[PDB]
Write an enzyme that holds these catalytic residues in place. Sequence first.
Site, PDB file in Angstrom:
ATOM      1  N   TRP A  62      -3.546   5.261  -8.794  1.00  0.00           N
ATOM      2  CA  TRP A  62      -4.780   5.440  -7.798  1.00  0.00           C
ATOM      3  C   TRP A  62      -5.894   6.365  -9.087  1.00  0.00           C
ATOM      4  O   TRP A  62      -5.312   7.739  -8.518  1.00  0.00           O
ATOM      5  CB  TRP A  62      -5.372   5.493  -6.623  1.00  0.00           C
TER       6      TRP A  62
ATOM      7  N   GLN B 260       1.070  -1.270  -0.192  1.00  0.00           N
ATOM      8  CA  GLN B 260      -0.189  -0.085   0.075  1.00  0.00           C
ATOM      9  C   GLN B 260       0.626   1.200  -0.420  1.00  0.00           C
ATOM     10  O   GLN B 260       1.716   1.175   0.683  1.00  0.00           O
ATOM     11  CB  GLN B 260      -1.289  -0.371   0.971  1.00  0.00           C
TER      12      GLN B 260
ATOM     13  N   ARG C   5     -20.483   6.733  -4.323  1.00  0.00           N
ATOM     14  CA  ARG C   5     -20.778   5.089  -2.463  1.00  0.00           C
ATOM     15  C   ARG C   5     -22.910   6.043  -3.104  1.00  0.00           C
ATOM     16  O   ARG C   5     -22.774   7.772  -2.854  1.00  0.00           O
ATOM     17  CB  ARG C   5     -20.150   5.784  -1.859  1.00  0.00           C
TER      18      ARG C   5
ATOM     19  N   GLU D  68      -9.910  -5.729   3.522  1.00  0.00           N
ATOM     20  CA  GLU D  68      -8.499  -5.280   3.436  1.00  0.00           C
ATOM     21  C   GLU D  68      -7.582  -6.063   4.411  1.00  0.00           C
ATOM     22  O   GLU D  68      -6.740  -6.162   4.612  1.00  0.00           O
ATOM     23  CB  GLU D  68      -7.804  -3.952   2.862  1.00  0.00           C
TER      24      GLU D  68
ATOM     25  N   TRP E 195     -10.857  -2.163   7.970  1.00  0.00           N
ATOM     26  CA  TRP E 195     -10.915  -1.616   6.656  1.00  0.00           C
ATOM     27  C   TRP E 195     -11.501  -2.652   5.565  1.00  0.00           C
ATOM     28  O   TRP E 195     -11.475  -3.019   4.706  1.00  0.00           O
ATOM     29  CB  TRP E 195      -9.285  -1.181   6.122  1.00  0.00           C
TER      30      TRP E 195
ATOM     31  N   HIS F 102      -2.453  -3.725  -0.018  1.00  0.00           N
ATOM     32  CA  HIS F 102      -3.357  -2.985  -0.323  1.00  0.00           C
ATOM     33  C   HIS F 102      -3.959  -3.996  -1.220  1.00  0.00           C
ATOM     34  O   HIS F 102      -4.347  -5.033  -1.931  1.00  0.00           O
ATOM     35  CB  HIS F 102      -2.434  -2.008  -1.674  1.00  0.00           C
TER      36      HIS F 102
HETATM   37  O1  LIG Z   1     -20.217   0.616  -4.863  1.00  0.00           O
HETATM   38  C1  LIG Z   1     -19.701   0.067  -4.754  1.00  0.00           C
HETATM   39  C2  LIG Z   1     -18.216  -0.048  -3.883  1.00  0.00           C
HETATM   40  C3  LIG Z   1     -16.939  -0.677  -4.820  1.00  0.00           C
HETATM   41  N1  LIG Z   1     -17.109  -1.152  -5.748  1.00  0.00           N
HETATM   42  C4  LIG Z   1     -15.704  -2.341  -5.841  1.00  0.00           C
HETATM   43  O2  LIG Z   1     -14.394  -2.409  -4.982  1.00  0.00           O
HETATM   44  C5  LIG Z   1     -13.461  -1.716  -5.017  1.00  0.00           C
HETATM   45  C6  LIG Z   1     -13.261  -1.711  -3.625  1.00  0.00           C
HETATM   46  O3  LIG Z   1     -13.972   0.190  -3.499  1.00  0.00           O
HETATM   47  P1  LIG Z   1     -13.043   1.155  -3.216  1.00  0.00           P
HETATM   48  O4  LIG Z   1     -11.781   1.179  -4.129  1.00  0.00           O
HETATM   49  O5  LIG Z   1     -13.898   1.899  -3.512  1.00  0.00           O
HETATM   50  O6  LIG Z   1     -12.432   0.806  -2.505  1.00  0.00           O
HETATM   51  P2  LIG Z   1     -11.052   2.516  -1.757  1.00  0.00           P
HETATM   52  O7  LIG Z   1      -9.755   2.108  -2.564  1.00  0.00           O
HETATM   53  O8  LIG Z   1     -11.051   3.200  -1.841  1.00  0.00           O
HETATM   54  O9  LIG Z   1     -10.220   2.172  -0.052  1.00  0.00           O
HETATM   55  C7  LIG Z   1     -13.998  -0.589  -6.646  1.00  0.00           C
HETATM   56  O10 LIG Z   1     -12.679  -0.301  -6.768  1.00  0.00           O
HETATM   57  C8  LIG Z   1     -14.992  -1.079  -7.178  1.00  0.00           C
HETATM   58  O11 LIG Z   1     -14.278  -2.547  -8.328  1.00  0.00           O
HETATM   59  C9  LIG Z   1     -18.120  -1.352  -6.883  1.00  0.00           C
HETATM   60  O12 LIG Z   1     -17.721  -1.579  -7.894  1.00  0.00           O
HETATM   61  N2  LIG Z   1     -18.917  -0.213  -6.186  1.00  0.00           N
HETATM   62  O1  LIG Z   2      -3.003   9.830   6.505  1.00  0.00           O
HETATM   63  N1  LIG Z   2      -3.626   9.883   4.883  1.00  0.00           N
HETATM   64  O2  LIG Z   2      -4.346  11.505   4.493  1.00  0.00           O
HETATM   65  C1  LIG Z   2      -4.201   9.037   4.045  1.00  0.00           C
HETATM   66  C2  LIG Z   2      -4.275   8.916   2.889  1.00  0.00           C
HETATM   67  C3  LIG Z   2      -4.972   7.974   2.553  1.00  0.00           C
HETATM   68  C4  LIG Z   2      -4.554   6.651   2.951  1.00  0.00           C
HETATM   69  O3  LIG Z   2      -4.657   5.550   1.557  1.00  0.00           O
HETATM   70  C5  LIG Z   2      -6.286   4.843   2.301  1.00  0.00           C
HETATM   71  O4  LIG Z   2      -6.006   3.528   2.773  1.00  0.00           O
HETATM   72  C6  LIG Z   2      -6.573   3.055   4.007  1.00  0.00           C
HETATM   73  C7  LIG Z   2      -5.874   1.674   4.973  1.00  0.00           C
HETATM   74  O5  LIG Z   2      -5.288   2.487   5.856  1.00  0.00           O
HETATM   75  C8  LIG Z   2      -6.880   2.235   2.985  1.00  0.00           C
HETATM   76  O6  LIG Z   2      -6.080   1.654   1.882  1.00  0.00           O
HETATM   77  C9  LIG Z   2      -7.918   2.729   1.843  1.00  0.00           C
HETATM   78  O7  LIG Z   2      -8.424   2.230   0.558  1.00  0.00           O
HETATM   79  C10 LIG Z   2      -6.780   3.984   1.144  1.00  0.00           C
HETATM   80  O8  LIG Z   2      -7.598   5.011   0.430  1.00  0.00           O
HETATM   81  C11 LIG Z   2      -5.121   6.516   4.095  1.00  0.00           C
HETATM   82  C12 LIG Z   2      -4.827   8.100   4.939  1.00  0.00           C
END
Ligand SMILES: O=c1ccn([C@@H]2O[C@H](COP(=O)(O)OP(=O)(O)O)[C@@H](O)[C@H]2O)c(=O)[nH]1
Ligand SMILES: O=[N+]([O-])c1ccc(O[C@@H]2O[C@H](CO)[C@H](O)[C@H](O)[C@H]2O)cc1
Lengths: 287, 287
Positions: free
Chosen positions: B275, B166, B284, B236, B233, B199
């Site tokens: 990303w 990650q 959402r 994850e 999370w 990640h």
């Molecule tokens: O309403 C939703 C929520 C999640 N996803 C799928 O699940 C993955 C994980 O969710 P998200 O990427 O939003 O989590 P994040 O990485 O932002 O923490 C997404 O990339 C999508 O592939 C989706 O298709 N619709």
């Molecule tokens: O300290 N931040 O501003 C900060 C910025 C981005 C971050 O990424 C976040 O991490 C999470 C786990 O901690 C998940 O992996 C999530 O999908 C990711 O957006 C987490 C923290």
Amino acid sequence: KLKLSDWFNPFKRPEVVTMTKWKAPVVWEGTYNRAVLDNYYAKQKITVGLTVFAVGRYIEHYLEEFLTSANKHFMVGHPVIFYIMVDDVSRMPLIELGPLRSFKVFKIKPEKRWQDISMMRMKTIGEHIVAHIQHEVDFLFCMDVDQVFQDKFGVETLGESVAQLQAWWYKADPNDFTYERRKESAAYIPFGEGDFYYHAAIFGGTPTQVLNITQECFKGILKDKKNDIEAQWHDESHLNKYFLLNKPTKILSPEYCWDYHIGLPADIKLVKMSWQTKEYNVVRNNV
Amino acid sequence: KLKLSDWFNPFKRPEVVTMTKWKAPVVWEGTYNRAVLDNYYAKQKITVGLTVFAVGRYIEHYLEEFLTSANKHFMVGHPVIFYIMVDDVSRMPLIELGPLRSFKVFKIKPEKRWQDISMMRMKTIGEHIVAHIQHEVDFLFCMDVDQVFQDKFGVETLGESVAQLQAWWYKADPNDFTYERRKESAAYIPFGEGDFYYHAAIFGGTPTQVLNITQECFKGILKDKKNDIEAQWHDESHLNKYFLLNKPTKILSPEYCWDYHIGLPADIKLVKMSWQTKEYNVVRNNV
Ligand SMILES: O=c1ccn([C@@H]2O[C@H](COP(=O)(O)OP(=O)(O)O)[C@@H](O)[C@H]2O)c(=O)[nH]1
Ligand SMILES: O=[N+]([O-])c1ccc(O[C@@H]2O[C@H](CO)[C@H](O)[C@H](O)[C@H]2O)cc1
Ligand SMILES: O=c1ccn([C@@H]2O[C@H](COP(=O)(O)OP(=O)(O)O)[C@@H](O)[C@H]2O)c(=O)[nH]1
Ligand SMILES: O=[N+]([O-])c1ccc(O[C@@H]2O[C@H](CO)[C@H](O)[C@H](O)[C@H]2O)cc1
Ligand SMILES: [Mn+2]
Ligand SMILES: [Mn+2]
């Protein structure tokens, strides 16, 4: 090395043509050992391609039914790629595919005349062979959309160049065949010449051979246009001329492309593919 | 038979972590010999799968951009199958694919909570592996849709089980990781434990290993539901618990999944994947 006798037994169908004068098999139900071939090809890890065109209302009328039946029946047990050519991708029916099937879709230009839609396939297939198909599959079939798979259409149909006996003419004498008979056309076949009447609805082979088939047919199609002539049955006339000069290494019986309007005579034991009823008033837009 | 030293040279990147205590490589730009691996795998005739989910607004926002970039960058020179899971197939963008790319689409049920959409992926991936993917590919990657391929993401990433570092946490001390810290959760990792923060946006391996990954993660997800708890999370947290117990045979550097919001520091030499900016307010439907 795979030998004909390993999988092909003509004596199982003694009342039909099973071998040509150039020693190519004609594949009839009963003659083939699919188990032997499935094992042999699975060890080679082959992939088989299938091209299909649907332009205009051919999409709504035929594409879903073709693809649904192809998924179920075409080369089961082996990786298969469907190559779908449509003029409008928004009308593409996205069916669910089963194990070892995948696909990709290409947007193509719609030709003004249905005759040119049919004939331009020869050019388009060749372009796709060069661009990608040659790198993706070991064998390729090129098929009409206006038909439906009815039973297993498997590895017994594979070869270097594969031709299909047209359902209506397979018992006919060559002088009765609807070859192009005008010497001015590139598709011209004289009376006294010809082996079989081949259906343009199914042909195939290796990418190398299919490339040559389509290239040579399209050259003839282009030459005819320059001489202000159009072959009687279009790409099919040209395909018949090609297969006269360059004999297919395998022929498929009419069981692999059958017209139920004929009925079901003794020779047709298990239908693998059937024609859709013609709907020209709807699906075609010119005479 | 492929050895690590055939393709992996850690001494090309001395200022980063390139090997784990369990002797797995951490793949950084400069450490890998892709030419060696491309030849090795081409002779084996491998196929690589890629699952991606898009449910609700994620379809219009991210799916096209994901697939267009995957077509361009993912395992170029090798057969690839994209497995697309969406709740509305009529909204699927049917992009043109290049040589050695194909796909198939599946309609899935939309879960009510975005958390469950994310987590249910574990169940659905497993079902598809047993149903078909195990028969179709040698390796599989499972990815988030909300990201874009930026450069070659190739055979140097393949292995028995593959994890992703990650981007935000790779330099952090494990006891600062956002592991699930409540002992009531199946995803619990105590302080004093942990190797890396992985990640959930990218994981992969052989169909066999990915099946175990997804099955065990989903078992953890279901167990938590019976205990009235949800991991901080979500999938994850469970993925991190899995990779603690069952060490990945390969890890990918943050170069393979980079957040440009961090900027671009000296360690990140060539970004393979970035990303998408978070748009939770739009994409959402629940907190
Ligand atoms: O309403 C939703 C929520 C999640 N996803 C799928 O699940 C993955 C994980 O969710 P998200 O990427 O939003 O989590 P994040 O990485 O932002 O923490 C997404 O990339 C999508 O592939 C989706 O298709 N619709
Ligand atoms: O300290 N931040 O501003 C900060 C910025 C981005 C971050 O990424 C976040 O991490 C999470 C786990 O901690 C998940 O992996 C999530 O999908 C990711 O957006 C987490 C923290
Ligand atoms: O307007 C047209 C005309 C032809 N075709 C394609 O070309 C094939 C051959 O034409 P058709 O089947 O109509 O000829 P027939 O078999 O009826 O003589 C069709 O199956 C379609 O795949 C098409 O998509 N749209
Ligand atoms: O004898 N019939 O009434 C007859 C002849 C031909 C038929 O099928 C068509 O055959 C031509 C070539 O002769 C093309 O293959 C065309 O695609 C077929 O529809 C049907 C009945
Ligand atoms: Mn037809
Ligand atoms: Mn994400």
